[PDB]
């Protein structure tokens, strides 16, 4: 009962069976389900010669509603995924609990954060967006340079921060804006805007049929008194991000340039909120993520085109009532 993997793990329908074990909580919301599903085990170091170490990292973000269930989405991640720590918004001043090393004070206890304390894993945030700007400063390298570097003690040593990042914040403006622009929805400074990722949002409008469907599901959920189990896929992802080490090959990597141009030409000063050369490479992260969801190690148009599917949906998500830019632009792509 160990080939539990390879009695099943190679079917074509298993693109979506992973979604059924994210959080068995929500009727809707396939998108973030799939996004966290891929990003829980995706990753590649691909250290080229002496330059740098690229990423075992991503920052998916959902800036939704103050009270749509978001903070519950996070916990099953921890209850399956191998590492963590719990932290909520309003952490330290981002310094952390800068010591000088003496046998006075009996060693003047020592640490610098928690990405120092949990690398190549997770450690949790909730309800961030109403926190000290003096932390939104501080965490703003470890995400991408994946490197720490300190001073201001008896020492200037340095240490490794290879991680990813939880998101869990809260919007401003009451609940959530219309399709009117996003930079107006929550106001974070210019040199933080740099990185960005899996852009989803719990925008709400009322359907009574769906209200009936899910509410049946809810009361059914409240009616349990006394495809995948959590019994297994835990180990699938241990295996998947530990042992197999995927790749890429030239198949269609020029198409990426036309779509980046589709950003820059359809989006200049309307929506295109400095989404530089990190999210593009996050394209690759999705593709490599997909093939490790397959234990493939290479791929054809499939995985990359799935990345294009999801991104095409999202960037239509976060526009104006004029909401169909890449939609009209990609019926030919689609």
């Amino acid at each position: 009962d160990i080939a539990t993997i390879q009695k099943l793990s190679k079917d074509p329908r298993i693109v979506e069976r992973v979604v059924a074990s994210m959080a068995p909580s929500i009727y809707g919301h396939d998108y973030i389900k799939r996004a966290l599903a891929l990003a829980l085990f995706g990753g590649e170091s691909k250290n080229p010669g002496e330059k740098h170490k690229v990423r075992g990292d991503i920052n998916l973000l959902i800036c939704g509603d103050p009270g749509t269930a978001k903070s519950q989405f996070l916990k099953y991640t921890e209850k399956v995924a191998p590492r963590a720590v719990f932290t909520t918004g309003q952490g330290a001043s981002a310094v952390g609990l800068y010591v000088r090393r003496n046998p006075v004070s009996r060693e003047w206890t020592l640490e610098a954060g928690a990405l120092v304390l949990a690398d190549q894993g997770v450690c949790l945030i909730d309800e961030f967006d109403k926190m000290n700007d003096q932390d939104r400063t501080s965490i703003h390298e470890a995400m991408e340079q994946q490197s720490i570097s300190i001073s201001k003690a008896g020492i200037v040593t340095s240490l490794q921060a290879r991680c990813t990042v939880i998101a869990a914040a809260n919007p401003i403006g009451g609940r959530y804006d219309p399709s009117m622009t996003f930079s107006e929805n929550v106001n974070l400074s210019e040199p933080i805007l740099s990185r960005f990722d899996v852009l989803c949002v719990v925008k709400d409008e009322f359907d009574p049929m769906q209200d009936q469907q899910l509410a049946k599901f809810v009361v059914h959920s409240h009616m349990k008194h006394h495809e995948i189990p959590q019994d297994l896929l835990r180990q699938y992802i241990v295996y998947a991000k530990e042992n197999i080490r995927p790749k890429l090959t030239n198949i269609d990597e020029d198409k990426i340039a036309k779509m980046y141009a589709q950003l820059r030409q359809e989006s200049f000063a309307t929506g295109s909120l400095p989404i530089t050369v990190r999210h593009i490479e996050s394209v690759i992260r999705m593709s490599e993520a997909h093939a490790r969801m397959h234990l493939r190690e290479n791929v054809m148009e499939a995985d990359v085109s799935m990345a294009i599917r999801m991104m095409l949906e999202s960037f239509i998500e976060a526009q104006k009532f004029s909401v169909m830019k890449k939609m009209r632009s990609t019926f030919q792509k689609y």
Binding site: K247, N250, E297, N298
Partner: protein
């Protein structure tokens, strides 16, 4: 023989040593030595191809009568190749043996070292050039052509009842006055059954290039230890009975030991530093027991690997289990064998030889030699040759082919060794870059069968696989790779092809042919086999090498040529 003909060799000469080979350099540096010994100045040559050869002779448009080429010859009736040859002395000594007969005959400008237990091709000239059908070398009934041409009195002569020779049967008509042509073609074609058995179905190699040369210089009283080692290098190249055959291994255990052991110039005083006369021992073709740890070099050879299947994990599991029975430590399995402690690194092979009898490997141990220069370290039998092949370094400087040749021949001295370790290093990195592609291509399922063979093609250029030696090596690691584990026992026996990109040369899509499994003596079809499609459609093909098993095409003019070459 040339205990008589060598006494011709005093005048001027040209010593050419045809396209890159380890037979070549080993066979030639000895003769460079020999020839600055009897006070002769001469010419050694790099060969880039048959055209390189022909321009080379063109640049040497003198009357150097003692012309010499070695390890070549089967290209033409080479008087047709080399017209201005009038009575010029050539010497052939090639082991590419399936050679033309017009080069053998015409006892003018050639050396028929015809010595073989195959008396099978005697009239092979007695009917193709000696007979003919529907020919012009003849007379007519008119009085204007009343002169007797080169009357062979055969089919080479007329077919109109004018043949004074050809006295086996009737004259005027057998069944008709031109049944001459009938029987001519009868013998012609019924024995092209055997002519086409030659040169148009299969090719091979024969014997040494330079062990005969050792016996030549042995009769002049030279006990050059180093010459034993150089010839050893020349043989241990294609001693690889899977690559190209030795055969005589268990007979040369008498031959060469008898050359060298019986004449013991010092039986009691040899415990000295410099060049303490060569020894012999039974060891492996494990790659590089010596200067590396086990666990990387237990992993890049094919034969050790394919039988135990390590490019997947499970091979490593059973591997560790046999290190277990061996009881090697893993640290010790990751320090250089010499860098190990003593007793383990003494008893290593002592145990491995007998308790690998029982676990899936039988064919790793060999018989070979090794020796010291001094106290630095104890060089190995082949770690020259696997350092050599890494010197075919086709850099874009345009000088590095011939320069690397000249470097290589300047390597096997006892002097130049700072480069020899360089060759080792270069070799290793390439050797595990070999492995680096097999996992990629196997488990991407790139094994294109496409009918009667297996087939590979690749996409861009590697400096490994710019040139074709590395390419044949690729093909000859994957093949065992795939055919171990993806098959039943029926289809393990079919041949293999492989593309070879040359982004350097404007797009040519190089290829190399190679053979199915475990048939040592039953060798290549591909002495000609590719040329079928060359006839059928025929597109810009080349056969430039005296090596047969190779071509060079355009980037993209192959696939339809392949579809023709299905059969």
């Amino acid at each position: 023989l040339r205990n008589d003909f060598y006494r011709q060799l005093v005048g001027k000469r040209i010593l050419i040593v045809v396209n890159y080979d380890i037979d070549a350099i080993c066979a030639s540096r000895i003769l460079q030595a020999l020839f600055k010994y009897d006070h002769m100045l001469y010419t050694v040559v790099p060969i880039m191809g048959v055209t390189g050869l022909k321009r080379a002779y063109g640049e040497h448009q003198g009357d150097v009568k003692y012309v010499v080429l070695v390890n070549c010859g089967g290209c033409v009736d080479i008087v047709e190749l080399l017209q201005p040859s009038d009575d010029v002395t050539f010497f052939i000594c090639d082991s590419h043996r399936p050679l033309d007969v017009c080069n053998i005959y015409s006892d003018r400008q050639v050396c028929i070292l015809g010595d073989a237990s195959l008396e099978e091709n005697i009239p092979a000239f007695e009917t193709i050039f000696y007979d003919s059908e529907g020919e012009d070398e003849d007379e007519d009934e008119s009085s204007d052509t009343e002169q007797q041409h080169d009357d062979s009195g055969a089919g080479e002569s007329d077919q109109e009842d004018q043949a004074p020779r050809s006295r086996k049967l009737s004259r005027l008509e057998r069944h008709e006055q031109r049944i001459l042509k009938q029987r001519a073609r009868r013998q012609w074609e019924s024995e092209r059954d055997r002519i086409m058995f030659e040169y148009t179905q299969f090719s091979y190699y024969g014997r040494s290039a330079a062990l005969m040369v050792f016996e030549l210089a042995w009769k002049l009283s030279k006990d050059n230890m180093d010459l034993l080692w150089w010839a050893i290098v020349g043989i241990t190249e294609q001693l690889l009975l899977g690559k190209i055959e030795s055969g005589a291994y268990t007979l040369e255990l008498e031959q060469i030991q008898s050359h060298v052991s019986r004449l013991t110039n010092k039986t009691n005083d040899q415990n000295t530093m410099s060049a303490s006369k060569i020894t012999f021992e039974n060891d492996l073709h494990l790659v590089l027991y010596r200067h590396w740890p086990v666990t990387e070099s237990m992993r890049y050879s094919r034969y050790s690997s394919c039988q135990l299947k390590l490019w997947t994990l499970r091979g490593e599991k059973r591997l560790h289990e046999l290190l277990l029975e061996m009881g090697l430590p893993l640290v010790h399995a990751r320090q250089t064998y010499g860098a190990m402690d003593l007793v383990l690194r003494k008893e290593f092979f002592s145990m491995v030889e007998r308790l690998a009898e029982k676990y899936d490997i039988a064919d790793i141990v060999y018989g070979t030699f090794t020796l010291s220069y001094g106290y630095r370290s104890r060089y190995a039998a082949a770690d020259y040759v696997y350092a050599l092949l890494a010197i075919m370094e086709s850099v874009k400087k345009h000088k590095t082919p011939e320069d690397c040749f000249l470097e290589a021949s300047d390597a096997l001295s006892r002097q130049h060794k700072q480069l020899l370790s360089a060759g080792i290093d270069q070799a290793k990195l390439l050797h595990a870059a070999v492995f680096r592609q097999v996992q990629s291509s196997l488990e991407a399922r790139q094994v294109h069968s496409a009918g009667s063979f297996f087939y590979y093609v690749l996409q861009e250029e590697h400096a490994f696989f710019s040139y074709p030696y590395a390419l044949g090596l690729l093909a000859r690691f994957l093949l065992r790779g795939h055919v171990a584990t993806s098959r039943a026992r029926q289809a393990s026996d079919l041949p293999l092809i492989a593309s070879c990109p040359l982004n350097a040369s404007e797009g040519m899509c190089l290829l190399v042919g190679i053979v199915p499994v475990r048939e040592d003596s039953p060798r290549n079809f591909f002495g000609k086999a590719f040329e079928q499609a060359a006839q059928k459609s025929g597109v810009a093909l080349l056969q430039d090498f005296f090596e047969p098993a190779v071509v060079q095409l355009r980037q993209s003019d192959l696939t339809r040529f392949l579809d023709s070459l299905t059969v």
